[PDB]
Each structure stands twice: as C-alpha cells, then as structure tokens.
Scaffold this active site. Structure first.
Site, PDB file in Angstrom:
ATOM      1  N   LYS A   1      30.209   1.941  -2.382  1.00  0.00           N
ATOM      2  CA  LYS A   1      31.166   3.086  -2.873  1.00  0.00           C
ATOM      3  C   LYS A   1      30.170   4.262  -3.301  1.00  0.00           C
ATOM      4  CE  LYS A   1      34.954   0.316  -3.624  1.00  0.00           C
ATOM      5  NZ  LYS A   1      35.732  -0.117  -4.664  1.00  0.00           N
TER       6      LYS A   1
ATOM      7  N   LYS B   1      33.559  -1.832 -13.037  1.00  0.00           N
ATOM      8  CA  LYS B   1      33.898  -3.118 -12.421  1.00  0.00           C
ATOM      9  C   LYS B   1      34.541  -3.969 -13.247  1.00  0.00           C
ATOM     10  CE  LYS B   1      29.698  -3.569 -11.532  1.00  0.00           C
ATOM     11  NZ  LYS B   1      29.210  -3.721 -10.253  1.00  0.00           N
ATOM     12  N   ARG B   2      35.294  -5.252 -13.010  1.00  0.00           N
ATOM     13  CA  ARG B   2      35.846  -5.992 -14.168  1.00  0.00           C
ATOM     14  C   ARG B   2      34.786  -6.443 -15.123  1.00  0.00           C
ATOM     15  NH1 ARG B   2      40.953  -8.056 -12.917  1.00  0.00           N
ATOM     16  NH2 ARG B   2      40.628  -9.098 -14.705  1.00  0.00           N
TER      17      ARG B   2
ATOM     18  N   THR C   1      31.034  -4.490  -3.894  1.00  0.00           N
ATOM     19  CA  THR C   1      31.382  -3.338  -2.920  1.00  0.00           C
ATOM     20  C   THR C   1      31.465  -2.099  -3.631  1.00  0.00           C
ATOM     21  OG1 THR C   1      33.736  -3.930  -3.536  1.00  0.00           O
ATOM     22  CG2 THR C   1      32.777  -4.724  -1.453  1.00  0.00           C
TER      23      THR C   1
ATOM     24  N   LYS D   1      28.383  -9.886 -14.715  1.00  0.00           N
ATOM     25  CA  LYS D   1      28.176  -8.469 -14.467  1.00  0.00           C
ATOM     26  C   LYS D   1      27.238  -7.764 -15.523  1.00  0.00           C
ATOM     27  CE  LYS D   1      32.352  -8.325 -11.903  1.00  0.00           C
ATOM     28  NZ  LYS D   1      31.848  -7.694 -10.391  1.00  0.00           N
TER      29      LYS D   1
ATOM     30  N   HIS E   1      34.094 -16.272  -1.491  1.00  0.00           N
ATOM     31  CA  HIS E   1      33.654 -14.904  -2.307  1.00  0.00           C
ATOM     32  C   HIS E   1      32.942 -15.339  -3.571  1.00  0.00           C
ATOM     33  CE1 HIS E   1      36.047 -12.117  -0.068  1.00  0.00           C
ATOM     34  NE2 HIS E   1      36.976 -13.329   0.328  1.00  0.00           N
TER      35      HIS E   1
HETATM   36  O1  LIG Z   1      37.191 -10.461  -6.435  1.00  0.00           O
HETATM   37  C1  LIG Z   1      36.623 -11.588  -6.609  1.00  0.00           C
HETATM   38  C2  LIG Z   1      37.716 -12.917  -6.793  1.00  0.00           C
HETATM   39  C3  LIG Z   1      39.051 -12.812  -7.240  1.00  0.00           C
HETATM   40  C4  LIG Z   1      39.620 -13.873  -7.701  1.00  0.00           C
HETATM   41  C5  LIG Z   1      40.923 -13.547  -7.807  1.00  0.00           C
HETATM   42  C6  LIG Z   1      41.973 -14.487  -8.195  1.00  0.00           C
HETATM   43  C7  LIG Z   1      41.586 -15.663  -8.597  1.00  0.00           C
HETATM   44  C8  LIG Z   1      42.332 -16.918  -8.988  1.00  0.00           C
HETATM   45  C9  LIG Z   1      42.463 -18.032  -8.478  1.00  0.00           C
HETATM   46  C10 LIG Z   1      43.180 -19.188  -8.768  1.00  0.00           C
HETATM   47  C11 LIG Z   1      44.034 -18.792  -9.691  1.00  0.00           C
HETATM   48  C12 LIG Z   1      44.268 -17.615 -10.406  1.00  0.00           C
HETATM   49  C13 LIG Z   1      43.320 -16.495  -9.876  1.00  0.00           C
HETATM   50  C14 LIG Z   1      40.247 -16.051  -8.430  1.00  0.00           C
HETATM   51  C15 LIG Z   1      39.283 -15.181  -8.097  1.00  0.00           C
HETATM   52  N1  LIG Z   1      35.485 -11.887  -5.864  1.00  0.00           N
HETATM   53  C16 LIG Z   1      34.531 -10.886  -5.255  1.00  0.00           C
HETATM   54  O2  LIG Z   1      34.938 -10.545  -4.115  1.00  0.00           O
HETATM   55  C17 LIG Z   1      34.248  -9.375  -3.470  1.00  0.00           C
HETATM   56  C18 LIG Z   1      34.599  -9.044  -2.372  1.00  0.00           C
HETATM   57  O3  LIG Z   1      33.889 -10.092  -1.272  1.00  0.00           O
HETATM   58  C19 LIG Z   1      32.604  -9.548  -3.695  1.00  0.00           C
HETATM   59  O4  LIG Z   1      31.959  -8.222  -3.442  1.00  0.00           O
HETATM   60  C20 LIG Z   1      32.361  -9.974  -5.199  1.00  0.00           C
HETATM   61  O5  LIG Z   1      30.859 -10.093  -5.261  1.00  0.00           O
HETATM   62  C21 LIG Z   1      33.197 -11.369  -5.499  1.00  0.00           C
HETATM   63  O6  LIG Z   1      32.883 -11.634  -6.994  1.00  0.00           O
END
Ligand SMILES: O=C(/C=C/c1ccc(-c2ccccc2)cc1)N[C@@H]1O[C@H](CO)[C@@H](O)[C@H](O)[C@H]1O
Ligand SMILES: O=C(/C=C/c1ccc(-c2ccccc2)cc1)N[C@@H]1O[C@H](CO)[C@@H](O)[C@H](O)[C@H]1O
Lengths: 810, 810
Positions: free
Chosen positions: B654, B542-543, B650, B548, B351
C-alpha cells in the site's frame, strides 16, 4: 368488484403496477423467474406503504404547526394483527390493488395470507388498544400509542395429542415492512443504583443504563388522510456495557436486551417477576422523556393543557412516580405543584375485578430496582392517607384498606391504589363493571373522591371488524343506506326499516351462508377436518380461563351427545360446536380444559350413530387473523362468563356486528348489548350478579346440583370413569374434583338454565326467516359498540379535546 | 473535477438528484427540514445501490446460463471497510454523484465520513480476502465469498491515560444498506449428538440444530458490469428450540445465536475455545450445503470441474471432513471416490510460520461437538500414514511428525496437516515464505508430495488503494499514461521514462504535500493534536505484535530524542513519527508497548528544547478507513519484522503504491518489492534469515549488545529508572526484562544497523529532488503487487479457470 372497496381508476391501476415492479426489482432484488408468493406479498406491501408516507409526514407537520393537545396512550400490549388489508381499506385502495395484482397474474387474497400477525398482546386488553388507535386516527386526534417492540409476541399454539404445545412467535423473521427504525431518537433508561441526598435535593446515582430505541409504525385514519404514530421501544445495550473477559462482555449484552425480547403470556394471573417490572419501567421512562422533549419543543403549569396520558390498566402505573421524579428531582418543582400537574395529566382504565389479576409488587423488588421510585411512592402514600384521616377521622380500618402499601409476610405496593390516587379520572369498561368498582373493590376511594369515577363502555372498530373481514355484509348494507355508517355506526339503526323486507332477509342469510361455506373450506384445506355447512355454527373463541366457563359449554355438548345416544332416531338441529383460544403456559387447569375439549371431539366426531348431526372442533392458534375468518361465519356467539367476572368483553361485539345471535349471561357489555337490541332478541340465561352474591352468603354446594339433576350426574360419572379417556381413566379427576369441591365460578348453578336456553336457540334456528329477522335486529342496534363512540367519550369527558371528522388535504 | 472520477452527464446528474429525493422521502421517511447528515448519507447509499441491482441480477443469471466453474473463497474474515466510494469508483459514478450532491447543497466527502467500516477482520488475512473479492469480480470470475456476519466486528480502540480500552463495534446500529437478507435460503447446521452404525453406514443422530440465515452483499468489478456476491451467514435458533419454563426457553435462544455474535480478535495467538470451533463449523456446514445445492441445480465425478474451494488459512479446514461426511454418509459414495473428489476440489493457503498461531484443536472438544468428523479425521490420518510408511519404510519418526493427531498431555488435531493431506495445492503468500514452508515446517510433506506446494505472492487492489484513497496521484499518472493501468497495474512501468521530467517530479511532490496537509488537518479536527507538515512522516501502522517490532521503532525514537538533548543546537531533519494499531485484548506485552509509545510521546512532545523537530503520535483506532487517509500522507514506511516472521505483509505494498519509501528487513514480500524496485531504491537493513539462524545456533545473548553499545545502554537505564514513567518508576520493568532475557525476536541485534539506515533516510530527505526521483522509481515498479496479478495466478495454476477482462452488457 364491490362498491365499498373503492375505485379502480386506469391511472391508479397503471401506477400501482409499475411501483409493484419497481419494488420487486430494486427493493427485493428479484425478477419474476425466481419470485415466490412471499416476494410478491412484500412488493405489494412496500407499494401500499409508499402511499402512507406523504400523509404521515404532513400529519406530523400539521401537529407541529397547530400544537393541539396530544394524547399518549400507554400500553404494554398492542394486538394489531395484519396491516396490509387494513391499510388498503383506510386509504380506499383495495379495488385498485385487486385490479393491479389481477393484471399481473396474481391473487391478492393469497398474498394477504402470507403476512404474519403482529401478535403483541394476549387478548381483550391488547386488542382494545389496537381498535383505539384506529378510532383516534379516524377522529382526527393528535394521538400516539407507546409500547414495547417484543421480538416474540404471543406464542403460536400447536395441538399435539390433544395437548397445547407452545412455540415461539418469531414474527420478525422475514422483516416488517411497516415499521421505521429511528435510532437517532434513542434514549437512556436507568435501573438499580442508589439515592443520595444533597442540599439541592435527591439524586439517583450509580445506575445501570439500558438504551431505548424507537420504531415507528403508521396508523392511518379511515379516508381522512390522517396518519398517526405507534412508537414501540426496543432495548439496546450501551457500547461500553461490561467494558472470557472480552468475548464474554460482548455476549453479556443479551442481559440488557432481554427486556424487549418476549411478551408475558399470563393474562389473568399476576406473576411478580423482575423481568416484567423492568419492561414496565422501560416503557414508562423512555415514553415520558419523549413526551417532555416534545412539550419543550413547542413552565409546567400548561403541561396538562398540552398532554394527556392514558394508562391501560396498572401495567404502566410507574408513569405516576416517574413523572414526579422528573418534575421534582430534575426540573426542581416543589412537590405540591408537581403533584397537581401529575394528577391533571394522568388517567387510569381498569380492566378487571379478579383479585389475582391485580398488580401488587413486592417492596424488596422496587427497593433494589427503583430505589428512588419507592421513596416517592411512600411519600405519595403518606400525603394521601393524611387526606383520608382528615375526611374520615378515627376510621383506622379505612386507613389500612386504602393504603398503597399492603402489610403482611411480604410488604407489597398496590398499583391500582397508586393509579387512583395519582389520576384525575378512573374508568371501568362497561356500565355494570364501573358500578361494581364503585360498590365493592374501590368503594373507599369513591367515597373520598366520587368525581374521579367514570364509565367508558368498550367498543370495536367497524373498519377491521366489518368492512375488512365481512365485505359481503358491508356491501348489502351499503346498497340500502350508503357508506357513511362506516365512520358513524349509529346509522345502522336505519336497517330496522328493512326487517320485513323479503329481499334484504334473503341477502343477509345468503352472506352468512357464503361466509360459512368459505370457512368450512378453510378448515379442510389448512386442517384436514370435514364439517357440515348446513349446521348451526356454535362458537366460543377467547382465551381459556375458568371464569369464561368453556367447561359449561363442554357440559352442554356432552348433554347433546347423550340425548342423541338415548333417542338416536329423533330429529335434532345439527350443530358444529367450535371452541378456541390459548391457555397461559403455567395455567394447569386451562391446559386440562383444552385436553377435555379435544377428548370430547375424539368420541363425538367418530360415533357413527351421531352422523353429521354433532361435531366438536378445537380451533387451533386463535389470534386476530383467525378471528377475522371465524367470526363472520358464526351463527351463535357463546358469552357465558359467571355474572360479575367479565369486565366488558369485546368478542361479544364482534359477533353482534357480523350477524350471529348471542347466548350469554348478564355480564360485562352483554347487559348493554341486550338493552340496545331488546331482551326478546337475545338469549339471556343464568344468575345475575345479585343471585351470585346470595349463593356466596349461603355457601355454594355443587353436590346439591349433582344430586338433583340426573343428566348432570351422568356426565360427571362419564368423566370420572374414563369414558372420554379409555387408556387413562383418571385423566380428568382434577376437573371433576374442581367442579365438585372448589368451583369459584359456579358452573353447575347455571347448567339447567343454560341447557334450556340452548333448546330455545335450536327452536329458532328451525325457522330460517325468523332467525334472520332477529339477526337484523341485532346488527341494526350494534352502533353503540363502535370504538369511535368510545373514543369520542374519552376525548370529551377525560382528555378535554374535541374529535373532528374533517379530511386533511392530499 | 478530475478525469479518473468519470463523466458528470446532464441526464445522469438530473436522475441521481431525483432518486436521492425519492429515497429521502419514501425510504427514510424524512423531509429536508428534519434530515441530518446521516439521513443524507443513507439517501445517497440507496441511490447508488439501485445502480448495482440490475447488474447483480444479470451477472447471476449469466452464471446460471453459461455454467462456468465456480470459485468459493471460504474465510472467517472479510475486512471490507466502507462501501459507498468503492461502489461509485467501480461504476464510474463518483463525479456524477459529486455534482448531484453539490447541486443539492451537500458535500459528498462529509457524507462519506458517516459510513461505518465493515470491520469483519483483524488485519492482513481479512483485508486480503477483501482485495481478492474485488480482483475476482474485476477479472470476470464466477466467484463467491463465504463467511460469517458478525454482529460485532473488530473492537473500537480508545486510548485512556495512554492505555488501550476496547469497546464494542456495533456497526449495524443504523442498518446496513448494502446487504440483502435471504431468509428463504436458510439452512440447518448440526452440533453435538452421537454416531450410530447401521448396515447402511454411519448416521449422525440426536443433534442440536442451529439455523444459518444468509445475507448477500454485492461485489462490483471495475467498470465491467460484473457484480459478484459475498454471502455471510447469521445464526438463528429454530422455533421449537428448548420448547421460568416458557420465558426462559425463549430467552435461551441467545445461546444458539451467539455463534455469529462476535469476531475473535486474537490474530497471532491460537486459543482453543469451543465458541470459535462452533463458528468454524457453522460457516463450513452452511456453505457446503449451499455449494452442493447449486451444483445439483445445473454424478460427483464432475464436481471438481465445476467447483473450487479455497481455504483461507486452516480456519475453514473442517470443509475437508465435512465434504467427506456428505459424500460418504449422505450420498453413499465409497471412501476412495469421495477422497479423490475432495482433494481435487480443495486448496489451502497458509499465512504464518509462528507455532503459536497454528490451530491444534483438543480431541475432547471435537469428540463432544463433532463426533462424526473426529472419526473421519482418524480415518484420513490412518490412510495418509499408510502412504508415508510405504514411501519411507522404517522411518518411524517421520510417521509421528506427519500425523494429523498429536500425542501428548492432551491429544490434538493439527489442522494444517489435515489441510495438506486433503488439498491438491498448498501455497504460501510470498516467495521467501513459500520456500520456508518447503524447507522447515512442512519439509516432510513436501518430500512426500512436492507437486502440491506453490507460491502466490500477495497483492492489493489498486482501486481502493490508489484511485479511491489517492485521487490526486491517480490523476497525474493518468495524464501521462492514460487510465488503463487501473486494471493492468504493470503499465506503471511506463513512468520510468519520466524519472528525469521536471514537471512530473514537481507534481508527484505536490500531491504528497497536499495529502500531508490534509492529514495534518484531520489530526487537529478529530484529535486536537498539532503537527508540522514540513517534517518527514515516519509511519508504522499494523497490528501490535512483538514480531512486528514496534519496540525497535521505539528504540530509534528515543535515540533521536537523546541525540537532540545532547547537541540541541545541531540541525536534524524534522520528523513526525506515527505508530498505530490494535492489540489483542488478552496480549499483555502488546498492551504494554502501546503504553510505552504514548509515554514517549508525553516526554518528547512537551520538551521545549526539541521544539517541532520531533513528534511522536499514537494513531488511535487504526482500521481500513484510517489506512486510506494515513497511507497517502506517509513519506517513510516502517516494515521491520525480524527476518523470517512476516509471511508477506500487505501494508508494505500500500505504501509503495502511494509514494512512500520503505525502510525494512529482508522479510516477506519486502524481498520481492526490493527486487522489483532495485535495492538502491530501498532502505534495507538487518539480519537476513540465514543470520537469524546462525544466531540461534550460537544462542542469542542480549546482554552482549547492551555491553557494547553505549547509546542502547542509556535507553535501557532510562526505561528501568522511570524516566518515561516518573510517578511509577517500575512501570516498564516487564519490557526491559523481556528485551534483556527472553526476546524471541532479537530487537537489540538489529539496533545498530537500523539506526544507521535511518540516518541515510534523513540524508536523502534533505535533497527533495532525489527523494522524489527514488519515489517515482518505487511507484513505477509496484505493478507486480496488484491483487489482479495474484488472482490471475490462483485462477490458472490452482483453480483451472481463465480470467476475462470483457464487459458484460449494461
Ligand atoms: O492476518 C493474519 C492472521 C490472522 C489470524 C486471525 C485469527 C486467528 C484465529 C485462529 C483461531 C482462533 C482465533 C483466532 C488466527 C490468525 N496473517 C497475515 O496474513 C497476511 C495475508 O497473507 C500476511 O500478509 C501477513 O504476513 C500475515 O501475518
Ligand atoms: O385482557 C385483559 C387483561 C390482560 C392482562 C395481560 C397481562 C397481564 C399481566 C400483568 C402483570 C404481569 C404479567 C401479565 C395482566 C392482564 N382484560 C380484558 O380487557 C378487555 C378490554 O377491556 C375486557 O373486555 C375484558 O372483559 C377483560 O378481561
């Protein structure tokens, strides 16, 4: 099957069957190919609970309309046990559910065994609160029980290598179908902070907030359609609490929530621990806001006409200064008016005389945790001592004796003194105990305010403690005298006119025999232990304490074993001696006593010369549901506390109602039980209180008894030399040392008389007909010891409300 | 009322009404004189849940009989949002419940607002998992989602003084009616300990045990009577755990239970914290025992024919060595056979490409926590590198680049490398991202095993993201082309033949206008903020992350404000610029960006010369339920990440489905969206990936842009000098400093092109008819971005199973 279990109507049975199937499908989300017995238990419980809810809603609606005086029973303990069968009994559904489940291919008794005990208490005081809720509902009183929803109740006891091990009582693991969470009635409780003085009075500021979330459990009356509420508070952190940085702040929510996590298991020692003080304030602060809210939703002059608060021991004693705080600081009443309202509202029940059980909180703890309450307590004390000074001028020692503040290395608050000062009534729990309070420990208070002091002799509910646990006995009684005795236990007196009836004699004896066969079977199934059901079942079950003298019992057991080994071919009445109960985790001597009992078992139960003439079994994990099984099976009830130490006892009453004879000292309620039955029908022995006092003046010297009683000396040598612990010969030295040099409870002094009395018990048991006739005389006179009598006396003499036996409409 | 919301039959409505009243009485224990709207919400939810259970039981029974290949989707995040309306939509109950509640005197939309979001995710990756469960059920796949039941999900965001404050998301406070606890399927998970080697292999001993208790939530398909399961694990301590002494041992149970307490909120940084590693193993260990149990209850040769495990990022990567551990250590398969089974079973979805988001765990952590897994990982690495060495002999740098073990100050395990080695398929989530994986970060792996690498372009569920949140739009579409598009979104292409239809044009525009009026009203009611509903709704939600480029948006906003202040009496298209999203609690720059947005608002929204021509609003607490409201109301979707940084996006999809036009870079799925709609119907600007690469070779110098663009210089001076923070002039120095000297994301380099593109957007918005025609062309070509297309590709190209659109029987 049996009449007291109610009707099994075709309409009722059909409807229970479809509701059972509905719950299995929609509530549990199972079908019958995957359902376990636990699923079937839950489907039954939800089905029975549905029958409560209509009555619960209309009972509380009824109280809203009629606005009666409300009774609030505050306790840190509610020892409820299981709920399913009790609910069926009280709603007249037992036979219908039995039929419905039978038709579904299920055994209801087997499903009943799946329910966890609600073990939210230690023993007597906690179980009394439970009996009391049942009687208050049965008597139509607008009563609420308030306590704490402990996540972990009294620990489960395992015996490993003859030693107690404790494990957590995770009683909520599978869910509790009886409670309803009420998050919408959540209330804030304050801790720490500091006091600011303004022109407009004191203000308690900079406090930490913990939330109190209530869970309500229904308490049904016996066939009167009354369903009262037990409200237990659970601790929750506020959502900005503390707010790793972020992660750690979320994890630290545990700190606040620990308040309601675990029941303190130490029931006749006082430990001044901060967490326990938080529990005590938490229950009091949330409860009082709830009470006041309900009072406003109908001028504080009328508060005591609409509210009674009963304090179960000193554990909720902070209600007194909290009520003062709310009235003075928040409602702006003047001090004297507030005090008048408080005193008229509160009443205090004392449950012991042992000095180490009295709550004396260090001032420094209250100072930090509850700074405003400390100030109020000092002010109460000052005004109280001004009244003492005026009534007994010059009596300076009386002033220091009666003070709420105890001077010393660490200053402490005496919570019993606070309760007496701030209550319009103070009662002990049996006649002898209430007399002792007036003559010794609260003498000074009784001379100042004699009108405050009362007796309310304890009782037990005949629903749980006869109909539920001993249906066979309840039925043969009902055949002769009808059913009304179940809510009017004095009617058991009519049974005296059957003491010479040969049919009744045979039936009483047959019920006991069936109960004993049943229990002997339970022992093999769930514990691989094999007993003779023709032996006399000699039972001592209660918490392990030196004052209860399980050790005296041990000495008798060893005497019997030694007499058999000396004359093995002589006849003796066979016995199964059963001892059970939990020891407080920190109480070393209590743990040693358990180990001694199992060690005696190890020797006695495997000596081929003894055969099956003597067996010694330690009953593991004694709790309410185990009491319901062993008590109906007992022949002899051991009630042998040193005179003046057991305030009442309630186990004693359970055994009497269920057809055991009693061997006991003239202590607690034993005195009144013997008086009701007649001393000829009781096995009384030992020192009376007066004899104990004379021995103390002289000085108790245990060596004298050891020197003059050869059978006793032999036992002490056996203990000392490793007879009962071959691989560790000195294992029991602490016990010997205690018995010989610092026995506060004078075990040796009652030994001879106890052994002699036990011989008379054995003699009577050899004549089955006369044993059973004496039993009938006990059951027949057990009526005074119904908790319905007890609560009726509280209601008229303390709370100022009339009981009622009338049905609410269904 | 509207047709897509289903039938409101007399029989159905009547039955819903009586079941609602049943639940209110028996389940909630209320009557209508005391019930709050929250009580009414719960009565509705239980009523709707009842309709699920029959289908849930028969779906799982169906899978038992037919024994299809099962898909296990492992994720640390499931961002579900609310469940009530989704369930009604998927069961065709929305109009019946609307009618039933109307007749009871209740407004269903008001009841819907009471439900808490299940916020068990951070953003894109978590919401993708949720969309995927919906599509898998809708396509008849025997699929299970497995994760963790966090007690606290993503924090609630409050804005105080323009700053983010976090508070705990206590989402379970009132209970969750959708889940069913399954304590009877509880499983042990092991931690710590050590490895012993015997003759009969390795053994992992002396471990600490934590229990995993499952909670099952139903996932209904769209009108096909399929109900699949999401199983979330909760951490429980065993009852002898640790067993103040006693009190403290009970309180220390919290330590074990902390595993499932809180979601880590840091979504594009990696923090190597022990508690997160425990969470990752916990989900994997419990899930795999569950999988194997179910497989045995029908020889591991057939395991990959019956099981597919999909790893959502590397977060559950320990599935690979755990599967090896179970197969080798417990089932006694030889290594090579076990490895074959593992590789054929597992597949990995990546991702992101940002290096700081990659999981690289310190060896010392794994060594202590999971000693056996470390050994297995080393063994995997050794055998893998032997294959590399044979394929590229002498290429020693390739060996160190491809190793699972990274050398350095602290040795780390690269979890992405582990996932590639142990999976038969590896996919990115949009075409450009999947190409980037093959060309840059996993180039070495692609040269070794090209067959493993795939693309699966992300999607969204048109149930939640059209029918549920935008019923007005779904209805006017249904009028023209029927209802089938809801589960076959490619049918929206038929709408091209209405691009010149004057009726349709008016209706599309009317729906948008109503959505906007509705949202403008929501703003005033719940947030006291007053917007012009005739303005263009310019939305970036978005976050908050630097990649971004919310900051680029900020620069445009300030440019507009400055142009107005320069020529105040010139006409400009009015705008409401809305920005929202959460910042990770530790991410300082993200928090500064939020403060900048609110600060710009403070200036712009109160300048009387601007009037209502420009408004800047920070949308507080952005989450799934807020997305469902703002997205239907948007005119312009801001998708402006630096090219090569957003793997897919995503949110973009939407907005496209809901009638907004897109301004964006050629990044992630934007590329495919423009390709589907036609570039003429998209507002594309900025560097492509190739341009970013050329700038990096040369060296990015932000000063050059500042020197050559006077409008940009003016903004930087305004930031520097305290124009937006008068009382603290240097408040934004960190932001200026970052922009000028170390901007990894090249904000200035796209500034000119972005401002110019924004002018073209404004020009089109002045011609309402042509705007709406372009919108129609976007909606009409949004079909590719249904998650049903995505899942159908996973099913055929990765899992080896055929989707099915056939109804199960009701
Ligand atoms: O939301 C995310 C990543 C979230 C995330 C959440 C948690 C962690 C994490 C990992 C280890 C420890 C603590 C937290 C690392 C990453 N990525 C997005 O995924 C979407 C679905 O594929 C894509 O559309 C986005 O482009 C991508 O940034
Ligand atoms: O059970 C109890 C006392 C329990 C208890 C439980 C807890 C604590 C306690 C107090 C402070 C801190 C921690 C624990 C102190 C005492 N007393 C018994 O009460 C019965 C009901 O009146 C009587 O029948 C018994 O005689 C009496 O011993």
């Amino acid at each position: 099957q049996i009449s007291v279990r109610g009707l099994a109507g075709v309409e009722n049975v059909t409807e229970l069957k479809k509701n059972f199937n509905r719950h299995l499908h929609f509530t549990l989300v199972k079908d019958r190919n995957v359902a376990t017995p636990r699923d079937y238990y839950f489907a039954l419980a939800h089905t029975v609970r549905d029958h409560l809810v209509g009555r619960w809603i209309r009972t509380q609606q009824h109280y809203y309309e009629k606005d009666p005086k409300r009774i609030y029973y505050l306790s840190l303990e509610f020892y409820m046990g299981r709920t399913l069968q009790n609910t069926m009994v009280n709603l007249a559904l037992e036979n219908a559910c039995d039929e419905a489940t039978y038709q579904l291919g299920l055994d209801m008794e087997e499903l009943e065994e799946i329910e966890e005990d609600a073990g939210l208490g230690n023993g007597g005081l906690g179980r009394l609160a439970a009996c009391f809720l049942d009687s208050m509902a049965t008597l139509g009183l607008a009563a609420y029980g308030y306590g704490i929803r402990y996540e972990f109740g009294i620990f489960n006891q395992k015996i490993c290598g003859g030693w107690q091990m404790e494990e957590a009582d995770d009683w909520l693991r599978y869910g509790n179908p009886w409670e309803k969470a009420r998050p919408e009635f959540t209330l804030p409780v304050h801790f720490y902070g500091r006091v600011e003085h303004t022109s407009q009075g004191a203000k308690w500021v900079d406090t930490q907030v913990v939330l109190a979330m209530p869970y309500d459990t229904p308490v049904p009356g016996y066939r009167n359609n009354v369903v009262n509420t037990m409200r237990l508070w659970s601790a929750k952190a506020p959502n900005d609490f503390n707010l790793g940085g972020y992660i750690q702040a979320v994890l630290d929510r545990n700190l606040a929530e620990n308040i309601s996590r675990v029941l303190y298991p130490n029931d006749n020692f006082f430990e001044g621990k901060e967490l326990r003080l938080k529990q005590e304030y938490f229950v009091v602060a949330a409860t009082l806001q709830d009470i006041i809210r309900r009072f406003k939703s109908s001028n504080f002059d009328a508060f005591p006409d609409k509210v009674a608060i009963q304090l179960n021991d000193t554990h909720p004693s902070l209600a007194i200064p909290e009520l003062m705080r709310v009235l003075v600081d928040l409602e702006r009443l003047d001090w004297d008016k507030a005090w008048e309202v408080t005193v008229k509202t509160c009443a205090y029940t004392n449950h012991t005389v042992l000095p180490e059980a009295l709550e004396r909180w260090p001032v420094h703890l209250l100072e930090t945790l509850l700074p405003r309450h400390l100030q109020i307590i000092y002010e109460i004390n000052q005004r109280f001592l001004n009244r003492v000074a005026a009534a007994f001028p010059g009596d300076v020692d009386r002033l220091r004796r009666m003070s709420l503040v105890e001077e010393g290395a660490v200053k402490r608050i005496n919570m019993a003194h606070l309760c007496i000062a701030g209550s319009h009534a103070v009662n002990g729990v049996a006649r002898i105990h209430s007399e002792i309070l007036k003559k010794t420990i609260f003498k000074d208070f009784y001379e100042l305010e004699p009108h405050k002091f009362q007796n309310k002799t304890n009782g037990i509910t005949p629903r749980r403690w006869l109909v539920l646990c001993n249906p066979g006995l309840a039925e043969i009684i009902a055949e002769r005298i009808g059913e009304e005795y179940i809510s009017d236990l004095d009617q058991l007196r009519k049974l005296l006119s059957y003491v010479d009836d040969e049919a009744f004699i045979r039936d009483v004896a047959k019920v006991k025999q069936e109960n004993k066969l049943k229990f002997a079977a339970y022992l093999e199934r769930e514990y691989k232990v094999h007993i003779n059901p023709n032996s006399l079942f000699d039972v001592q079950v209660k918490r392990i304490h030196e004052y209860k003298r399980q050790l005296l019992n041990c000495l008798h057991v060893i005497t019997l074993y030694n007499r058999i080994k000396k004359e093995p071919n002589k006849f003796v009445v066979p016995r199964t001696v059963m001892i059970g109960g939990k020891a407080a985790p920190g109480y070393h001597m209590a743990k040693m006593i358990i180990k001694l009992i199992t060690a005696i078992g190890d020797v006695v139960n495997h000596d081929p010369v003894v055969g099956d003439r003597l067996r010694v079994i330690f009953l593991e994990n004694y709790r309410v549901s185990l009491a319901e099984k062993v008590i109906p099976a007992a022949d002899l009830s051991e009630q042998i506390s040193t005179a003046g130490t057991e305030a009442s006892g309630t186990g004693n009453m359970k055994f009497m109602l269920n057809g055991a004879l009693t061997i006991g000292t003239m202590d607690g309620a034993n005195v009144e039980m013997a008086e009701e039955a007649g001393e000829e029908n009781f096995f009384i022995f030992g020192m009376r209180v007066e004899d104990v006092d004379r021995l103390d003046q002289r000085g108790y010297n245990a060596q004298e008894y050891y020197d003059r009683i050869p059978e006793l000396r032999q036992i002490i040598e056996q203990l000392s030399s490793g007879f009962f612990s071959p691989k560790q010969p000195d294992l029991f030295k602490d016990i010997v040392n205690m018995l010989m040099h610092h026995d506060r409870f004078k075990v040796f002094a009652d030994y001879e008389e106890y052994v002699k009395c036990q011989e008379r018990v054995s003699a009577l048991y050899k004549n089955p007909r006369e044993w059973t006739r004496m039993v009938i005389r006990n059951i027949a006179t057990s009526g005074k010891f119904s908790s319905d009598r007890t609560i009726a006396q509280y209601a008229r003499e303390i709370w100022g409300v009339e009981p009622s036996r009338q049905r609410l409409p269904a």
